[PDB]
Amino acid sequence: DPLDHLADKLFHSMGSDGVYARTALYESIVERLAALITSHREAGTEALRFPPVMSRAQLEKSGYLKSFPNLLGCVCGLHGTEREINAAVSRFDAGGDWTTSLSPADLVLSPAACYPVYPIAASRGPLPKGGLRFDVAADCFRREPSKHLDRLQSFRMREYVCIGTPDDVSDFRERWMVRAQAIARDLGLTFRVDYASDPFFGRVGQMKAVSQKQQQLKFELLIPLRSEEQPTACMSFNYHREHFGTTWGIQDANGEPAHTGCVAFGMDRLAVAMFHTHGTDLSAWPAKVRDILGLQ
Amino acid sequence: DPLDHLADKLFHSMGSDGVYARTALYESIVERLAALITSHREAGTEALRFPPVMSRAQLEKSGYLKSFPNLLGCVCGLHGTEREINAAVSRFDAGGDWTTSLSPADLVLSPAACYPVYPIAASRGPLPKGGLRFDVAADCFRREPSKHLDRLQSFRMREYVCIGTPDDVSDFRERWMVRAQAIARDLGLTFRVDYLKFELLIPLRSEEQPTACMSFNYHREHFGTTWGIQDANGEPAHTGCVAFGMDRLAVAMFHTHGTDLSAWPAKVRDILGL
Ligand SMILES: Nc1ncnc2c1ncn2[C@@H]1O[C@H](COP(=O)(O)OP(=O)(O)OP(=O)(O)O)[C@@H](O)[C@H]1O
Ligand SMILES: Nc1ncnc2c1ncn2[C@@H]1O[C@H](COP(=O)(O)OP(=O)(O)OP(=O)(O)O)[C@@H](O)[C@H]1O
Ligand SMILES: [Mg+2]
Numbered sequence: 001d002p003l004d005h006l007a008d009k010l011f012h013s014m015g016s017d018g019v020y021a022r023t024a025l026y027e028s029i030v031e032r033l034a035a036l037i038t039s040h041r042e043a044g045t046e047a048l049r050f051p052p053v054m055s056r057a058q059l060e061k062s063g064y065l066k067s068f069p070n071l072l073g074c075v076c077g078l079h080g081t082e083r084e085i086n087a088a089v090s091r092f093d094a095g096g097d098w099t100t101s102l103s104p105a106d107l108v109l110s111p112a113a114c115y116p117v118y119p120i121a122a123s124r125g126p127l128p129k130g131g132l133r134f135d136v137a138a139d140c141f142r143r144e145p146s147k148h149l150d151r152l153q154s155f156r157m158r159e160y161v162c163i164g165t166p167d168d169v170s171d172f173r174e175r176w177m178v179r180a181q182a183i184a185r186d187l188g189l190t191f192r193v194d195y196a197s198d199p200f201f202g203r204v205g206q207m208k209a210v211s212q213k214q215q216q217l218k219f220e221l222l223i224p225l226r227s228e229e230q231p232t233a234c235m236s237f238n239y240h241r242e243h244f245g246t247t248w249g250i251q252d253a254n255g256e257p258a259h260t261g262c263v264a265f266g267m268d269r270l271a272v273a274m275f276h277t278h279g280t281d282l283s284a285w286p287a288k289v290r291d292i293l294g295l296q
Numbered sequence: 297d298p299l300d301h302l303a304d305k306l307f308h309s310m311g312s313d314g315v316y317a318r319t320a321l322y323e324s325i326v327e328r329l330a331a332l333i334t335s336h337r338e339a340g341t342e343a344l345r346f347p348p349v350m351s352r353a354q355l356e357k358s359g360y361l362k363s364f365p366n367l368l369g370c371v372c373g374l375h376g377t378e379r380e381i382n383a384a385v386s387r388f389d390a391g392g393d394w395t396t397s398l399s400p401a402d403l404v405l406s407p408a409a410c411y412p413v414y415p416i417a418a419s420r421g422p423l424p425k426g427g428l429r430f431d432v433a434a435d436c437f438r439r440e441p442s443k444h445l446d447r448l449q450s451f452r453m454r455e456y457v458c459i460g461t462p463d464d465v466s467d468f469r470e471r472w473m474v475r476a477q478a479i480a481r482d483l484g485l486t487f488r489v490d491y492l493k494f495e496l497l498i499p500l501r502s503e504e505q506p507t508a509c510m511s512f513n514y515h516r517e518h519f520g521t522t523w524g525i526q527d528a529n530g531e532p533a534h535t536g537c538v539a540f541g542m543d544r545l546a547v548a549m550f551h552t553h554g555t556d557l558s559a560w561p562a563k564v565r566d567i568l569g570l
């Protein structure tokens with residue numbers, strides 16, 4: 001794989017594919033990419049930082065189980081009696097299996113950074129005219145083990161979220177599709193923006209992907225990482241229509257179910273794209289690129 | 297509780313006790329506290345940043361299941377066939393329970409930041425004279441639901457780790473017991489060092505029951521034996537770590553100095569940038 005050779009200076013193995021320790025070099029680039037995205041934050045955008053976990057009921061309510069049940073990471077623990085727990089530990093001491101005593105928690109590992117904002121916005125009452133803007137970030141989890149550096153199980157997602165009228169969301173999504181391209185250009189990255197679909201699970205998933213594809217609810221900024229034939233989605237421009245507005249009872253300035261959209265930045269994918277494109281020696285990175293990332 | 301009102305300017309509810317969204321105000325303070333801890337990093341310290349998850353087998357081998365089996369957050373998923381997964385979702389649609397189809401993954405949510413460092417160090421062969429120093433950080437998880445702001449289920453842990461002879465670890469722990477106190481003093485915090493485990497305790501809820509915001513943990517040759525880490529003399533390596541509770545230190549700052557950064561002491565504002 002063309003990315004493999006980057007692994008030595010960027011990561012350390014943690015005994016699980018797509019779960020790596022980040023080196024000081026890798027992390028300074030993720031941080032500078034994070035700061036760069038912050039510099040493009042529109043005015044009146046509320047910044048929220050989410051933990052790696054969220055409410056299981058909120059995620060169930062958002063329809064994620066119907067879409068990607070195979071990717072979901074659910075939190076599990078020993079919630080039994082002291083007797084039950086001591087027995088589970090004893091089986092583990094005796095070389096047996098303690099995990100049979102596991103039961104689900106009321107938490108899941110967040111599969112996308114924006115899920116938790118909708119309930120938070122719903123709790124504030126009706127939206128003002130112009131809607132609401134959020135800047136969200138989270139360490140996400142998707143059960144997709146791979147040896148490829150651009151397909152992780154644990155990865156950082158930064159997003160700008162629009163909640164409002166279909167016009168508010170549409171304007172936002174157009175403004176962002178322009179800005180996201182200017183950012184990837186400034187970073188010296190080769191890309192193309194194309195219509196796309198979410199990887200919906202199963203037979204129904206195929207129909208759902210095809211419908212989303214033609215409705216143009218999803219665009220992606222694709223960067224060639226392993227091949228020019230199969231580029232990697234490093235940014236997403238998603239229009240949810242009134243899905244979250246209806247689910248959470250978010251109301252427009254005009255009392256209608258609110259429309260939502262989000263621009264997602266794959267922090268780990270963008271950092272890998274930078275190192276693949278420009279190499280592991282920062283002193284050799286183009287001056288324009290080094291300048292925008294605050295180096296020099 | 298004396299911390300409760302802090303929540304308005306600090307957090308947003310996420311529908312689970314001890315799991316909150318951080319505001320821009322709270323987050324800038326966590327970041328500045330993180331940068332401050334970095335400025336005290338001794339020469340030759342390797343910086344590693346860990347994700348919220350780690351190997352389940354590595355944690356099982358650490359001895360954590362023996363100690364706090366009730367706190368451990370394991371990762372579970374639907375690893376069945378497409379037929380089984382579609383049926384699980386269908387049971388949920390029909391008012392049943394989809395979770396019966398869950399099975400454990402090979403991952404856990406990390407309960408302490410240092411755990412993954414030991415197999416990484418072990419893979420490098422014998423330790424040089426003087427041992428190895430690491431600077432690690434992770435978003436940790438402990439299944440301890442609470443309404444108190446100083447006791448979270450998802451929280452940030454920053455740590456400096458020493459791997460070497462009992463002398464290397466002892467020197468390191470003496471150096472950090474001093475440095476940790478200088479940091480808390482510089483930050484204008486009221487503390488007492490107590491509790492082999494040191495804790496730097498700060499009153500947040502009460503002066504009677506202060507909160508452990510920093511700690512030194514000595515692990516003996518536990519990880520050295522478990523992972524086959526050999527010092528320069530070929531003996532099982534000893535390990536120690538100084539832990540900083542990022543969320544607890546952020547809450548301690550706001551409790552001590554208030555939510556208005558412009559009113560924070562000039563020395564405190566200076567050391568944190570600002
Ligand atoms: N498994 C992953 N590893 C690393 N980064 C990822 C992964 N999945 C998504 N991302 C990043 O987070 C962004 C937002 O997530 P999104 O739901 O739009 O992804 P996706 O449609 O599943 O992408 P892909 O087709 O590659 O699986 C992506 O554009 C990408 O930049
Ligand atoms: N549940 C928690 N919520 C927030 N921060 C925590 C929590 N547990 C531990 N910490 C922080 O992580 C640091 C190192 O963790 P450690 O295992 O040493 O603490 P602990 O003895 O379990 O603390 P406590 O007695 O309060 O439970 C602590 O010193 C504290 O700063
Ligand atoms: Mg996906």
Ligand SMILES: [Mg+2]
Pocket residue numbers: none
């Ligand atoms: Mg504890």
Ligand SMILES: [Zn+2]
Pocket residue numbers: 112113114115159238262263264
């Ligand atoms: Zn989103």
Ligand SMILES: [Zn+2]
Pocket residue numbers: 408409410411455513537538539
């Ligand atoms: Zn530790």
